[PDB]
Amino acid sequence: SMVKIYAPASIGNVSVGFDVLGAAVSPIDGTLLGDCVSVTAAERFSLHNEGRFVSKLPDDPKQNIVYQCWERFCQEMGKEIPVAMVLEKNMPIGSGLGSSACSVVAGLMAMNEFCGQPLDKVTLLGMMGELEGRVSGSIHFDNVAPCYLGGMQLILEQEGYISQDVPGFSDWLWVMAYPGIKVSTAEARAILPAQYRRQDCITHGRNLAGFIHACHTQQPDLAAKMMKDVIAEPYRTQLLPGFAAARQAAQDIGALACGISGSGPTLFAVCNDQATAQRMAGWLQNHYLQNDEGFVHICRLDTAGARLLG
């Protein structure tokens, strides 16, 4: 009896909603962009790591994100659940693709499914954000909630639910460009300023309020014009060599919007046809990548979220 979960890549913030908005992504070609966790019965607990980025994981086994999921799930159960766990780390660490969230969602969903769904959505998702906090020093739900539930998730920390779904535009493609370098979630958060001018908070509000209003009324142009982040982007693009050039070209080529994915350095660019997305994807390969570890994938929203493979 093996349970194997695929936790997809996700865009934090989505460049208009820092800490309260996120979207799971799926490349159109059918390739998997995510991390995987397997759970099987055993006498004693073991964890082994596989995949392309195994060597990037912690040297301290107890500080592994997937180990900490199991310890947290067992606490919730009141008992230790002996399993052979395997993490397959196919996503780069600190890249902007929801890497820590993939490993949290996959591990906690893997354990909850193995045990027969004892925990409900709100508890488990609350536990997922809990573990994001220990990773970056801050609880936030904008990567785990879409990784988990799929689509675009708006974070609304209410008694009955952590998030609700936001309607998208079926036309929109999301060209994702990981440049081959990493930024820590923690460092990219601490370099944010402690204070902002009143008018930035008025404008941030208007921007988010218009973006949401546009999604529910299905006005894609307006939506793109409201996709502006005055909170984190101005202070983070200094850590993204080449981003500002990417944005200039993105306009020239005809993307509807361009932005940082989570804390970066991965970028995303919105296009509303296949011809535009292909040109954008071609350019980013040629110009946004900093080395051979980088990649580009034309994506759409993943409406499934994390799921069972086997």
Q: CB of 114 within 8 A of CB of 308?
A: no
- Of 266, 257, 182, which is closest to residue 12 (Cα–Cα)? 266
C-alpha closest to that of 95 among 5, 29, 12: 12
Same domain, 183 and 136: no
Report how far residue 211's alpha carbon sits from residue 222's, in angstroms, rounded to the nearest whole number: 7
- Is 97 known as a binding-site position? yes
Same domain assignment for residues 72 and 155: yes
**259 belongs to an annotated ligand binding site:** no
Do 151 and 239 share a domain, yes or no? no
67-to-57, 84, 85, 87 alpha-carbon distances in Å: 12, 11, 9, 9
At residue 94's C-alpha, the angle toward residues 83 and 179, to 5°, is: 130
Q: Write the DSSP string, 99-145.
A: HHHHHHHHHHHHHHHHTTS-S-HHHHHHHHHHHHHHHHSS---TTHH
Could you tell me if 12 and 69 lie in one domain? yes
The DSSP result for the chain, as a single string, is: -EEEEEEEEEEESTTT-TTTEEEEEEETT----EEEEEEEE-SS-EEEEESTTGGGS-SSGGG-HHHHHHHHHHHHHTS---EEEEEE--S-TTSSS-HHHHHHHHHHHHHHHHTTS-S-HHHHHHHHHHHHHHHHSS---TTHHHHHH-SEEEEEEETTEEEEEE---TT-EEEEEE-S----HHHHHHTS-S---HHHHHHHHHHHHHHHHHHHTT-HHHHHHH---SSSHHHHGGGSTTHHHHHHHHHHHT-SEEEE-TTSS-EEEEESSHHHHHHHHHHHHHHT--STT-EEEEEEE-SS-SEE--
Q: Kindly state whether residues 88 and 233 are assigned to the same domain.
A: no
Is 101 assigned to a binding site? yes
* Cα–Cα dist 184/57, whole Å: 13
* CATH code where residue 90 lies: 3.30.230.10
Residues 155 and 73 in one domain: yes
Same-domain check for residues 292 and 233: yes
Q: Are 271 and 277 in contact (CB under 8 A)?
A: yes
Technique behind the model: X-ray
Q: Identify the domain containing residue 185 by its residue range.
A: 167-299
Q: How far is CA 98 from the centre of its chain?
A: 3
Domains contained in the chain, number: 2
Taking the C-alpha atoms of 9, 13, 19 and 24 in order, what is their torsion angle to the nearest 10 degrees? -30
92 is in an annotated binding site: yes
Contacting residues for 188 by C-beta, under 8 A, at least 6 apart: 232, 236, 239, 263, 264
Q: Are residues 67 and 175 in the same domain?
A: no
Residue 95 marked ligand-binding = yes
How far CA 144 is from CA of 107, 179, 210, 299, in Å, comes to: 12, 22, 24, 18
Which CATH number is 260's domain given? Answer: 3.30.70.890
Burial of 45 (0-12, 13-18, 19+ CB in 10 A): middle
C-alpha to C-alpha distance for 43 and 52, rounded to whole angstroms: 29
Handedness of CA 125, 131, 137, 142 (dihedral sign): negative
Whether residue 261 is annotated as binding a ligand: the answer is no
Instruction: Dig out the tokens for 152 from the structure.
Output: 């675009």
Please provide the distance, in angstroms rounded to a whole number, between the alpha carbons at the two ends of the chain: 9
- 78/12 same-domain check: yes
Indicate if 141 and 206 belong to the same structural domain. Answer: no
Return d(Cα 180, Cα 158) in angstroms, integer: 38
Angle at which helices 121-136 and 65-77 pack, to 10 degrees?
140
Residue pair 188/264 in contact (Cβ under 8 Å)? The answer is yes
The annotation status of 100 as a binding-site residue, yes or no, is: yes
Annotated binding residue 258 = no
Whether 131 and 227 map to the same domain: the answer is: no
Distance (Å, whole) CA 3 – CA 17: 34
Using only C-alpha atoms, what is the Rg of the chain? 19
- Contact between 21 and 297 (Cβ < 8 Å): no
Q: Measured between alpha carbons, how far is 18 from 233 in angstroms, rounded to an integer?
A: 10
74 is in an annotated binding site: no
Is the domain of 137 the same as that of 191? no
Angle, to 10 degrees, between the axis of helix 65-77 and the axis of helix 99-114?
A: 40
Select from 250, 248, 255, 251 the least CA-distant residue to 171.
255
